[model samples]
Target: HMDNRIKTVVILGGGTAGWMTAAYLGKALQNTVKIVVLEAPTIGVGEATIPNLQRAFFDYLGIPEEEWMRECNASYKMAIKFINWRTPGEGSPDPRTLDDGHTDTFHHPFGLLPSADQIPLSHYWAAKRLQGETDENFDEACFADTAIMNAKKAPRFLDMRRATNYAWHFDASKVAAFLRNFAVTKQAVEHVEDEMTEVLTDERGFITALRTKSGRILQGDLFVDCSGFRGLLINKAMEEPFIDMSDHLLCNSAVATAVPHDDEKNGVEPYTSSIAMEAGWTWKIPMLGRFGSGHVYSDHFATQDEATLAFSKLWGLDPDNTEFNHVRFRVGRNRRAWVRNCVSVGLASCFVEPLESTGIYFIYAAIHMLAKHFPDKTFDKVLVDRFNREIEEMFDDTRDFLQAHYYFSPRVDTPFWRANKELKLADSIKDKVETYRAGLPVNLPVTNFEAEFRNFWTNSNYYCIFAGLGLMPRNPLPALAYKPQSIAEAELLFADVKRKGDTLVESLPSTYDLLRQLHG
Candidate 1:
């Protein structure tokens, strides 16, 4: 007879991943199980978060937007502007400079593309682009472009009724501390700050307990390894093979440095900038305090010194004097995220590059799934299998999406970009391109975020990215007969959206002013 009831749950590692898991599980499984968190002494820092966390994450955790923003030194991100990933034609002076101007610049903005009630907005935009009826950048007609980017105003001013799309740019370390306090103070989740010096397992290869450095044996029926890349419990104890994904996701290294920002340079714009560089790319994230800047590049093409120098040129840092942290990581996950009574979350589970801010989203997804399907003492095979499958698919989808940015990129002069060109595309991404080329919409529900936004944002990200990369549908999509009779209607709708967007922007205070108001 199998007595399937889990009495205790222990989570390993703390940082953002560990604390987030603890907070969620503490609330979801309150009184159901004795929740305990053994956070490692030090936690790693940094991530530019994505927009998937609107309702599913903060709201679910019972955290208010203002409180988190004020406490975490957070800022808003409405879109990501990708630069120089595409070549700037045959002859262009300094393609990297956005001012000199090139056609390669595009945005994966938030909010809906403008459309009449009769038809999908994407089809209308595509039709206009194909028919040569519009000379404007296709994305200029987007809500994020017209409203947020143009005005340089924060998304907070936008009417909530019209849009529920936005993400935050927060200090990762502060967020972790804030969450830890929330879990301990409000949620009553037990927190133990100690070293997990030993992992105890049963005869059948199940984690039984963890031994601390102080010779204390803490037992639990289940364990979550948020120990980051170390994989103390998931890999060391469980012996799961690390599945390498560097083949699909290149640029296996990153050199990051936090640069201080004064008033002018650190304008609190509502977007992130993922600008392409010689070896790899650079991420410029705006938080309330100092801006987070990093050059995520492959060591194969450039040496550490070269990568740092490249980072310095873009960020105005002295290569010799500036301190940059070097981080080496393979873009992959464990062979099995869940094994027996122990599971892995956060970087311990998997880690792709922080290209599109998928870092924090992975942690959110893993714990969300765990809380939903809190396993019993048996750790039922069916539940485990399903959970593993969901996580694997998420990593796969994220890998495909992230890879598409490099794969479809037109930049190939540099050895790094050239290597990306040589690398084969994943079958999943290739098939997605084929599907779109065959005059079909990407109707796949693969990148499911959470709650209602999962369904609402279906294929929008893919569509935007594909279009941004010049990977449009092969044939022009059909236009709705009722509305856009002469392409004038489409133009009118675009202008209308722009006007409304301008109105929204004009109605709001400056981003700095708004931040002061919120904090005040």
Candidate 2:
């Protein structure tokens, strides 16, 4: 067992995935194992992260929130305001409007709804919707985060205690650099700044060592692939088949750029905005001084130049002068992220669109799962299989959730929007949609962190999107009819959320003010 235990881990690529994996493994193994991260020059982006980035990743590393936020120029994110997603160009006026009076929007907040007597809040909300007794949107009715976000308020109080769950928006490249420094300097993880020339394998087809351009042979008991879409080790060497999900998620191209904020004019928003566009959609992620903006579109419907023109027009930028990063991506996961002794993390493993900001969260999940199923020299197949299953499910969950966004959208004014309506959803997605259409989700919220990690998009998340898109069933859940007392209690809970949200909106500082105080 002593001989079989993994002594060293070699990670390929020094991007976000590579450094995050290094930082995680470095801390997890401590002095018990040697962690080496191989580097190659790379490009990157600014990212909107989910709450797990704090709870699952940063908290475990014992890093202070302000420390990293200051280093990365990050700002708080409480919810994602989805614009024009429900009825597209047809809905009543909203205070959250990012466009002309033609658009409708809703929020997908971070925290779970306050339940009443074991009955989820959605049932009560659904009952009200069916009876036409309430005009409150799902988010406005149930989540304090929405009100706080709409008011541009921070999630934290002056004492630094959190009033609600929140995430961060920052430059991904800076985050990678930050983690790289922490892993190498503080955690004693070795850094190799060279390209991988070759992957050497043993007779069993397990990776034995990596040959670098400098003619250095790097040997390790286990290997991790973080080489992004190129999949240098996992796809090129191991020949893992990529599962194409373009049919379900059609956006294959993106034109992204940073937009400077007029801080005084438009105070920093405490939420990310996903605005629906003609070809596909656009993402607006607010950081400290600037916001990262991007237009994701299907190449099948719009040319790169056309997409860029539309994106630039939306932001009122000169398409010819402004610098934009054009990216072509494949939307899918590998047949298995864990193959032989090699584990693929981040883009090397899978990539759903950045709709819900699952990119970094996926990396976080991969490293978290890897630590849970840490391998030895022998590389037990059971551990590998379990890890692959969990990883696959994570990707599938994100894919299906994203697909539902377009599938349920009422926007079909363009070819891209029309095509989404015809997407062939997975069985799991179909099952969940049908289940929700009948009643509340069959899958309850898992409060256990470990279990919740495995099922990242719980019923609460699905409920948010479903209700936001106005896809609620005609009839409320049958269970709600039998529980009148619970329904009445849920009304009180809804009132409580509203009251608390009002208090929070009045008390919390503006996101810009909070960031200034923290980063100053």
Candidate 3:
């Protein structure tokens, strides 16, 4: 059994995805197995991440926040501030105002809204909304991160006590490099820089060895494809079919660039900005010294030139001087992420756009799952099937969550927006959307163990987006109907949130100040 067990893992790429896989596997498996990362060029485009990067990935790796933050020129991100998403063009005189009277912007923050009396506080707010009693937006009423973000406050006190949940925006290239060093130096992962020219497979159709361009035949018991969209091993070698989700989630291209930050004038905000555009949307991810900005649009709706011009103009950058990186991506997942002895991680596995910053999180999730359902030379069918199911469910969960953003959006100004109005909805999303119309969104219990980790977006996340986009239930849930004392308590809770938000805004240091101190 020891001889039949996995001895070497050959990872075929070296960007964030590859290095993260290497680092994680190195740390988890230690020196028990030989890990080789076959380096190839990679595009460093995924700079924004969700809070799970801290809880699931970084915490597991035992990397201190400041150490990696300083190395990567990272800055805190507490929420994604969506601008002009609910309606149309900028400042369209929309009468729809959030709790703070902001008509064009709403935040999808990182943390959960507190529950009151064993029930979601969102139910109480819905009751108020139905009775025309409160004009407060769901996010402001539920989360303090919105206020903290608005004030450009960091998510922690000067003494490093965390005040709220937060993620990060960092240089993607630097992150890969940092992780590469960490993996090789600390975890003893072998670093091989080469191009995989051919994948050698035996009669059984399992990969036997990799023939690199440099004439080295590197054989491994297991293979990981972090080879981006090309899917060098997973698709190209294994011939796995791709399941396209373009009909549901349409934006398939992006024009990305970084601009120097004017810290003195427009100090770094503690949030990523997603501004709605004619054909699609643009993101502004604030790093330490520059803003990682990009316009993600469908080529079917807007030309590359149109997207580039729009992105540059929005950021006040000269198109002639600015270097833009245009990326065309297929929006979907592999039919099966793990096939034979090979597994695909990152973009090679799937891509659902960057709206929720799920790109890096996908890599984190896949590698974690791979580690959980890790295989030996026996290559157990049950383990493989379960891994594929979990990965597929995660993709489906994200697809539905993202699709709902477009379907529920009230924006119908452009052709893209109008098309989204007619976009097909997944049955899961359709059912949830219909159910939320009558009352609060409900989560049915999962009987299958593999399906347990599927729903990444909880009811609270749906509530934020639903309320943010002006989609409230026709009537409040009946659970709150007879609870008069609970209603009063909810009122007090809302006020307490406001008070706490104000105190945080007044006391916390600026995001820039905290980063400067930490780096210094």
Candidate 4:
């Protein structure tokens, strides 16, 4: 006989991951289950984010949008503008008419292209490309993005029910603090500020309690490991095998620091800028008042000092006075995230590079699944198996997407790029390349499926990354299916969208003005 009632849940470690789990679980479970969160007296450097189910997650916690933004020092982000990703030695005229000094900027916008609902606008855009319509190759084709980059506009505020196609750049430390307050005050969650010196497990291999450094015993029906890369409960106690994904992901190290704005330039950009470097890529994330910038490179190609110096020069930071934080991470996941009564979340569970902003996402995903199947007091075998499988799938899909960016790059100037060139892609990626070139719709089921582990990347995501990199069908005719109907109206529609985008942008507030309005 087994007791299905889960009375107490304990979380090990407190960062963005641990607090997120506690806050969400506290809100959902209320007084039904006692929630406890333990702190390790440390903070993480993870911050930049990609768009996801944030609205839903925040709304459930009763966090107002304004308050959330204010607490995290967050600013609206509409897209990621990738510059100089094309093959070196190839020159094209500057894309922005403002002479912004950016060379051939390409965007991967967040929202759907403005077009007829039944038909995707990409087909007509491809058809027009074949017909020599090349003026607004990037901006005009990606209309919503043009609103941000070209027009300096943000997402519409009218529709707040469904999650809009926008995200943000926020201070991750502040986010953890914000949620920590909410969990403790509103939901009556017990917050412990102490170190977990030891983990105690029973004869059946299920974790029973955590012994603190100060001789305190914390007991619970469930244990969640959010102990960052160390995996205090999941890896240290249970000893799960950690798989390294460096073969698939080349970049392993990063050096980060904050950059204050020069008032002469625009206050903050609504888009994140990802500039290609010699060995790796550097990210410039614009917040409300400052920019968070970092250099991410592989040790095989560049040293930490080289990466730090490269980052400083690119952003013009003071080498002597600037505050710097360097971190080394393995691109991999635990063989199994959940074992017995212990489950891991965030860096404790797995990690992909920060390329696509999957740091906080892993925490959100794990918590979402954990809430759905909030386990019974007696551990269930089926639930554990399903959770592990779904999480692994999520991790693998994201890995494939991140790997696609490097493998598809045209740059062969460095050993890093050369190494990536010889790397093999997964069979699924190759299949996408073959079918997309043939003008066949990608067979990704998640676009239609509403399952828990539904594919996060839609076809629109694939079109932006695959087609944005200047890849095309080996057979041009199939890729450019010239429907007579499409040929007649595609250019006209494209021209109209471009003109309308400019008008919409001019009517909206500047990115700088909009952010200050909240605080002002």
Each model's TM-score?
Answer: 0.91, 0.95, 0.95, 0.91
Worst 10 residues of 2 by lDDT: 90-99
Name the runs in model 1 displaced over 4 angstroms.
1-3, 43-46, 88-104, 114-119, 144-147, 158-164, 264-266, 444-457, 478-491
Residues 265-339, model 4: lDDT tens digits: 665677777777777887878776677877788988999888888778777778998989988886899999999
* lDDT head-to-head 3 vs 4, winner: 3
Tens digits of per-residue lDDT, candidate 2, 134-177, equal 86778888888888888898989867878889888998888889
Error of 1 at 199 (Å): 1.4
Residue-wise lDDT of candidate 3 within 399-463, one digit each (tens)?
Answer: 98898888889878889989987888989888888888888655632222234356467777788
User: What C-alpha lDDT values do all the predictions have?
Assistant: 0.75, 0.85, 0.85, 0.74
Task: Indicate whether candidate 3 or candidate 4 has the larger TM-score.
Answer: 3
lDDT of 1 by residue, 1-520 (tens): 7668888889888888888898888878866788899975661224577766756678888788778878877877777878777763222213344433544567777666544454445666776676676655557665545456656676665332333267888888998899999988887778887887888888899888899988878999999998889899889899999998888877988888777767355567667777788888888777664678777888888888888877787766787787788888767999989999888999999999888787888888888888777888767899999889888988887788888888888777877777887778889778878977755556534323454324433456676777777777767654344444645666677777778767777676556656556666
**Model 3 TM-score on a 0 to 1 scale:** 0.95
